[PDB]
Amino acid sequence: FQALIYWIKAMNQQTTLETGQNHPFFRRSDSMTFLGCIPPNPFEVPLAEAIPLADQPHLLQPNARKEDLFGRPNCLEVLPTKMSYAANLKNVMNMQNRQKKESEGPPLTSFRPQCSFMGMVISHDMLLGRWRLSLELFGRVFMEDVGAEPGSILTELGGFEVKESKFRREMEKLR
Amino acid sequence: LRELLSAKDARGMTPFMSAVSGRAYPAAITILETAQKIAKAEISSSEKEEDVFMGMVCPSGTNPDDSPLYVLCCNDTCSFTWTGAEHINQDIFECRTCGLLESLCCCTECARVCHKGHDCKLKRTSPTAYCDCWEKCKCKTLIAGQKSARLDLLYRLLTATNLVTLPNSRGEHLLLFLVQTVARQTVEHCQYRPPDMPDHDLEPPRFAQLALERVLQDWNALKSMIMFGSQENKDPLSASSRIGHLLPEEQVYLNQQSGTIRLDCFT
Ligand SMILES: [Zn+2]
Ligand SMILES: [Zn+2]
Ligand SMILES: [Zn+2]
Q: What are the beta bridge partners of residue B107?
């Protein structure tokens, strides 16, 4: 999984290369914008409910799940509902069948690749949205090993202690 | 008559339900025939025939543990009527509400009927025991009644009423209750031997086997048991039965599975 995201992530880097409630003051900020998610709007949702940490300040713990503190949030749109392995495989293949069913002009500097098969467009945020719990669990259990890959996507699920591991190294280096 | 038969006593029971509770099966039959006549007489009303009939037989808001078709099956005799004071290997219960603390005990039938609604717990001592309930208390399982009338009443209820579809107060569908009963009796009755204290030396009851054989012939009973645990046939108890208060995402997952633990335990 880690490697197959690497491939799509690289492809995506090739693809990218008011008083409104939409004004940046009203938008959700750092820690608040969940993986591939859209805000529980703070003008429709009670403060108490939108941010249980802002409601209850003593709720913060070092190893609390981020989902608590800021309120719980086609091949990818339909959720992983079935538990059976086999039916998922069969559905995967049927969905894949749905999508199945000198250079003149551009020089290389103008090459416009992407990932387009299996889904019509994949961006890694969607997949981080889909397998959210599996990811978080890997983001605790496999961090020492799969997290040692260069730029391993598991470190992005790294909580407090990952940042603190850098903190000692930097502060002791500065000391 | 409709009023007198739909009126409820101090324990919620119509006269019909009382006749069943007291083992007066011919009286229960007499009233049940009459109740059908009464319901069929008031067909000129803006009620459905059934509403009146169900009102007299088993009224709306009845605690499921008192539904007549279930009560008729619970009405077996205490083991003591056929074991006497001999010690046989059987299940036993303490009853703390009654001072039947852990040295003392009663057999399964007393616990189900003589101590209904008390604090009773399945005891952990050796199973080789008779049942103290006839001696320490006013034991209601000592009387067999008329066996032929008990069976006739069962047949009538099975065709008169939809009561076969209800689970009991522990979520057991009637069939799952009967088959466990037969399996239990099979072991207990094999210990029986021919030859102020109550009448002993009676022959053991075969009603559960007869009842199981007859109920298994009813399509509705069988369909109702096999479809148990489906989304339609929602088990009231111990079975994720309240869900509307959870946020919608968890409902859309948790509606998708279906239950078989009881269907598998029966089979
Ligand atoms: Zn007994
Ligand atoms: Zn008793
Ligand atoms: Zn008792």
A: B92
Q: Where are the beta strands (DSSP E) in B56-119?
A: 88-89, 92-95, 106-107
Q: How many CB atoms lie within 10 A of CB B173?
A: 24
Number of other residues whose CB lies within 10 A of the CB of residue B237: 12
Q: In what helix (H) or strand (E) does residue B120 lie, and over which residues does it extend?
A: strand B120-122
Strand bridging mode B128-129 / B106-107: unpaired
Report the sign of the C-alpha dihedral through residues B112, B115, B121, B122, in that order: negative
**Of the candidates A125, A78, A126, A113, the residue with the CA atom closest to the CA atom of residue A98:** A78
User: Which residues, by Cβ under 5 Å, contact ligand 3, an ion?
Assistant: B 95, 97-98, 115, 118
Sign, CA dihedral A22-A25-A26-A27, equals positive
CA nearest B257 in A: which residue?
A: A82
**Beta-carbon neighbour count of residue A74 at 10 Å?**
8
Minimum CA–CA partner of B252 in chain A: A81
**Total Cβ atoms within 10 A of residue B170:** 11
B219 touching A (Cβ < 8 Å) = no
| Most distant CA pair in chain B, distance | 67
Where are the alpha helices (H) located in A23-159, listed in sequence order?
A: 47-50, 52-55, 66-69, 86-100, 124-130, 132-141
Integer Cα distance of A95 and B209 in angstroms: 54
Q: Name the helix (H) or strand (E) containing B33.
A: helix B25-41
Binding residue positions of B for Zn(2+): 78, 95, 98, 107, 110, 114-115, 118, 131, 133, 139
- Evaluate whether A14 touches A50 at the Cβ level (below 8 Å): no
DSSP state of B203: P
Q: Which residues, other chains included, contact A43 with Cβ-Cβ below 8 Å and sequence gap of 6+?
A: A21, A26
CB atoms within 5 A of ion ligand 1 belong to B 78, 106-107, 110, 131, 133
Q: Is residue B171 within 8 Å of residue B262, measured between CB atoms?
A: yes
Q: Which resolution, in Å, applies to this structure?
A: 3.4
